[PDB]
């Protein structure tokens, strides 16, 4: 792609990102002092493991629906065959959610916006996946230290999704070309805003895959203990992406 086309690509991705976020960044920032009390935290800690998993799977499913809408607005995504669209979303939707979540993370007090207020990782104790929760909090903390703009997250998440290395891609060369153009848009934007210093600080190739693999593993453990809860009370989209339907 030429220069004018790259700038158009940057504008298009940033607009697609802003239009596909449930909450405005300004809404999240204005809620920072709205923190769960010690009584409310104890309340979440006293919830049954199955109740907390159900609540978390519903919130993750809603976040994924927004990621699907984001993918659909990406130039070239809708021109790929359905097999490749599905391969990219199944491999990348959770990774996009993990990156987007730093917008709802307050590095000042290590809290996340969850169910209307900010709370620390202790809110999630009843899930019984402490190692995964602390790794997600560590990841959001590491991204927050980069001070990403909303435009930087938009371009980086388009790249998390448009990855030609995903196994199962039928039109690999077509995805390599969309990836190259998105990489140019991302690097052009960083060069234009004097933010190329972040390139070295972006998470390593393998960190997102590790977090996604841990999520799937913890789900399998929960599913063995509460199979009827997953079958009857988890969203169908969640099961499609994480437990093969």
């Amino acid at each position: 792609a030429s220069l004018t086309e790259i700038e158009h690509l940057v504008q298009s991705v940033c607009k697609s990102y802003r239009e596909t976020c449930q909450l405005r960044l300004e809404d999240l920032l204005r809620q920072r002092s709205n923190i769960f009390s010690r009584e409310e935290v104890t309340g979440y800690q006293r919830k049954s493991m199955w109740e907390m998993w159900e609540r978390c799977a519903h919130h993750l499913t809603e976040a994924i629906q927004y990621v699907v809408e984001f993918a659909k607005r990406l130039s070239g995504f809708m021109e790929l065959c359905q097999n490749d669209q599905i391969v990219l979303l199944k491999a990348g939707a959770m990774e996009v959610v993990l990156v987007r979540m730093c917008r709802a993370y307050n590095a000042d007090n290590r809290t996340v916006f969850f169910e209307g207020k900010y709370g620390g990782m202790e809110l999630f104790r009843a899930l019984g996946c402490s190692e995964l929760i602390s790794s997600i909090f560590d990841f959001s903390h590491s991204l927050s230290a980069l001070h990403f703009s909303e435009d930087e997250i938009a371009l980086y998440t388009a790249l998390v999704l448009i990855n030609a290395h995903r196994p199962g891609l039928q039109e690999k060369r077509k995805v390599e070309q969309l990836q190259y153009n998105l990489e140019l848009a991302f690097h052009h934007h960083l060069c234009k805003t004097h933010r190329q210093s972040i390139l070295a600080k972006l998470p390593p190739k393998g960190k997102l895959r590790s977090l996604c693999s841990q999520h799937v593993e913890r789900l399998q453990i929960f599913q063995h203990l509460h199979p009827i809860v997953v079958q009857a009370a988890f969203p169908p989209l969640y099961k499609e992406l994480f437990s093969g339907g």
């Binding site: 659909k72 979303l89 199944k90 992406l241």
Partner: peptide, 12 residues
């Protein structure tokens, strides 16, 4: 198989 995703990608 992939019922929901197929519907979301078709739903225009």
């Amino acid at each position: 198989k992939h019922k929901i995703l197929h519907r979301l990608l078709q739903d225009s």
